[PDB]
Amino acid sequence: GSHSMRYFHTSVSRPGRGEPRFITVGYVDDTLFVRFDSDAASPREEPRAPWIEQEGPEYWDRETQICKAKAQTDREDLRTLLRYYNQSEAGSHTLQNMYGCDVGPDGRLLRGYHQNAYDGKDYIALNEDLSSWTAADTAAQITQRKWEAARVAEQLRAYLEGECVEWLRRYLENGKETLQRADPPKTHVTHHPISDHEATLRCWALGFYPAEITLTWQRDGEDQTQDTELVETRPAGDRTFQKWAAVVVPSGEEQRYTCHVQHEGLPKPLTLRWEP
């Protein structure tokens, strides 16, 4: 189906404890493939997926160079934003950036992205048109002015429509064994009595990839949207994900409850029940 590529960057100032820390990672869909940490022994972008290792020394040198440049511009920007927000140089602040593209089954650009946040809040973002900007405040408006005057959008658009989609397609082919293989969830329902009056029914989904999945409980065919406890999809550590949903059902009424599982790796949505 559709795929995506994303580069995530975080810079965190730490006054009195050296220069800001910089960490960036790259993903294709939900697979981490490259990382860089300014605090590592000899900072260099490293592979985190097998299909990227085949890239040549030139690839890695350029990537490492870009990471370091970004690290440097973030340090300058952190100082700049202190001014924009009339803030003291005593506190720790955060600058976050994400950019990348989404491509459809045919490998055509579906959407491009480029957004920044300061201290966890929206700062400035490139609009879906890849030509205009949305500034969160008067401070961000100043950055907008600089970027428009510098034609940043034009260049970003060029990358997003070109290199971004091209290399994503290249990565999808080189790592097809894994990037184009969906591991359906292994599912089951557990039952834990709470008291004489009720019990806990928990629907499990394990070892699935990609992360996207829908788990829902029904009582007599009615979605328990309001009465369902759903934990955040979590990484198992081996590339796959896990998740569960649970409801508190009046003891004896377990059979009126059905769990429904939707995952692209499943030919058809699943329906599970507690089998005592």
Binding site: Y59, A69, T73, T80, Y123, V152, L156, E163, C164
Partner: peptide, 10 residues
């Protein structure tokens, strides 16, 4: 593959 526009500051 990453993108880069030299000197892009906020």
């Amino acid at each position: 593959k990453r993108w880069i526009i030299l000197g892009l500051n906020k």
